[PDB]
Amino acid sequence: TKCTLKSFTVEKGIYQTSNFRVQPTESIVRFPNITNLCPFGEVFNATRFASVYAWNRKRISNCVADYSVLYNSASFSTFKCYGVSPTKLNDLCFTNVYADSFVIRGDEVRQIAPGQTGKIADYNYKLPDDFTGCVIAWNSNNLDSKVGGNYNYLYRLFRKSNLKPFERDISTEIYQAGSTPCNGVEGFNCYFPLQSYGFQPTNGVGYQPYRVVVLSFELLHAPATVCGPKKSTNLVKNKCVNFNFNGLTGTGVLTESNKKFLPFQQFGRDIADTTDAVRDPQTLEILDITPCSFGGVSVITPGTNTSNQVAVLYQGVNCTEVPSNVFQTRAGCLIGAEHVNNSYECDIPIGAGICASYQTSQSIIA
């Protein structure tokens, strides 16, 4: 009060000094349930895979891609994410996802990478210079290997020109290396384009089958349909906290309300366009949003020449949110004044018909 009035002698009366405000204790973020994750549970555990020249592109558009189950699993040999960090995969949205599944030899897995060249890249499947996605590969020598030679997987070896990024060729015309035209039959420079691979159960590292898939992420003029799985928190009702209900934000105490919303309405607003009620996206219950307690701090004190005792008043603040008698008045919580049942002339006006005075072993009374 001395600093507010800029004087060492404070006269008898009530003076406003500061403003009280209940600071938020913790912050909660709530989101709806995460069901029907993606067809990733079937695109990785498929029993049959296609060749490298006939790779299948599965439509992954509308499903919550759970990248945590793929990054935490310690069953992938090569896991390199280009243009994006593996940890930030569950914090960004995308438009369309495509998983190209195909089996390739182990010693030539390094050819499927941006900026790399070789024999399988420019002839079977080539990646652009810039790529926004990850690569997943795992050894499949346990089940994709039979005694006698596995001639079920083939690959395109001979081509007349380089392939474009994300290009798939179906025509299997015979290659021509010389000036003599190939009349549909093999000859000197007329060879078959497709060549079969040999997968034996006794082969060493490098020649074993490795099921490698490619994830492609693209962003165009369309609403994002695939996002990362956001995690919720616990619901704490009766305390000043920071809430986040599916994009919303603010600060207030969440008390159980009785406003029966409509089956499609999410949050409610009272007059003057203020968010006062939201629905929990998980339990579908409604609750009110009351702002946290705040108000001016007034210090009732007599003259400095009389005494140095003071009475603190929190205007419009209940006594249960303040943290030497503590008495609750209709004007606010008053601390430092003894409430008496007698009636005297109003000396220091407080409010709501209550006044304070410095009388009788000697303290401020209300």
Partner 1 sequence: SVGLPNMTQGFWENSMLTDPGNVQKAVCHPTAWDLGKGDFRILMCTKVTMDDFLTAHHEMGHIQYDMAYAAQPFLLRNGANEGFHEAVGEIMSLSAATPKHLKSIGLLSPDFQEDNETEINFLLKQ
Partner 2 sequence: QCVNLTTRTQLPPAYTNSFTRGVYYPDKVFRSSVLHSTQDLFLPFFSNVTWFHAIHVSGTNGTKRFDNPVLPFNDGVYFASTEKSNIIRGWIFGTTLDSKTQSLLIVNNATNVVIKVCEFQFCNDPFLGVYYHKNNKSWMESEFRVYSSANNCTFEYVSQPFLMDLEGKQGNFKNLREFVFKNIDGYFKIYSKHTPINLVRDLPQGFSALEPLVDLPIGINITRFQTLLALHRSYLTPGDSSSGWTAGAAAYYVGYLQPRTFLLKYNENGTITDAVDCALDPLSE
Ligand X SMILES: *[C@@H]1O[C@H](CO)[C@@H](O[C@@H]2O[C@H](CO)[C@@H](O)[C@H](O)[C@H]2NC(C)=O)[C@H](O)[C@H]1NC(C)=O
- Per the CB < 8 A criterion, the answer to whether 175 and 190 are in contact is yes
**Residue 80 contact, options partner 1, ligand NAG, partner 2, none, Cβ 5-8 Å cut-off depending on partner type:** none
350 binds partner 2 (CB under 8 A): no
205 binds partner 1 (CB under 8 A): yes
- Per the CB < 8 A criterion, the answer to whether 154 and 197 are in contact is yes
Q: The tokens of 324 are what? A: 């030497």
Tell me the per-residue interface mask from 37 to 66 with ligand X, x by CB under 6 A, - otherwise: ---xx--xx---------------------
Size of the site for partner 2 (CB under 8 A): 20
Can you tell me which of 4, 27, 62, 249 binds partner 2, judged by CB under 8 A? 62
Taking phi first (over 0 means left), then psi (-120 to 50 degrees means alpha), and beta for anything else, what does residue 352 get?
left
- Per the CB < 8 A criterion, the answer to whether 130 and 218 are in contact is no
- Per the CB < 8 A criterion, the answer to whether 192 and 186 are in contact is yes
**Residue 191 contact, options partner 2, ligand NAG, ligand X, none, Cβ 5-8 Å cut-off depending on partner type:** none
Site for partner 1 in 206-245 (CB under 8 A): 206-208
Give the shortest CB-107-to-partner 1 separation in angstroms: 8
202 binds ligand X (CB under 6 A): no
- Per the CB < 8 A criterion, the answer to whether 234 and 28 are in contact is yes
At residue 88, what are phi and psi to the nearest 5 degrees?
Answer: -90, 15
Q: What is the distance between the alpha carbons of residues 348 and 268, in angstroms, rounded to a whole number?
A: 43
Any idea which residue has 């606010």 for tokens?
A: 332
| Segment near partner 1 (CB under 8 A); pick from 47-55, 201-209, 314-322, 343-351 | 201-209
| Segment near partner 1 (CB under 8 A); pick from 153-161, 179-187, 199-207, 283-291 | 199-207
Give the shortest CB-96-to-ligand NAG separation in angstroms: 9
Q: What is the distance between the alpha carbons of residues 118 and 115, in angstroms, rounded to a whole number?
A: 10
Q: The tokens of 194 are what? A: 């497709």
Q: The tokens of 153 are what? A: 């997987």
* Residue numbers at the binding site for partner 2 (CB under 8 A): 59, 61-62, 221-223, 225, 259-262, 264-271, 277
* Residue numbers at the binding site for ligand NAG (CB under 6 A): 221, 260, 318, 320, 340-341
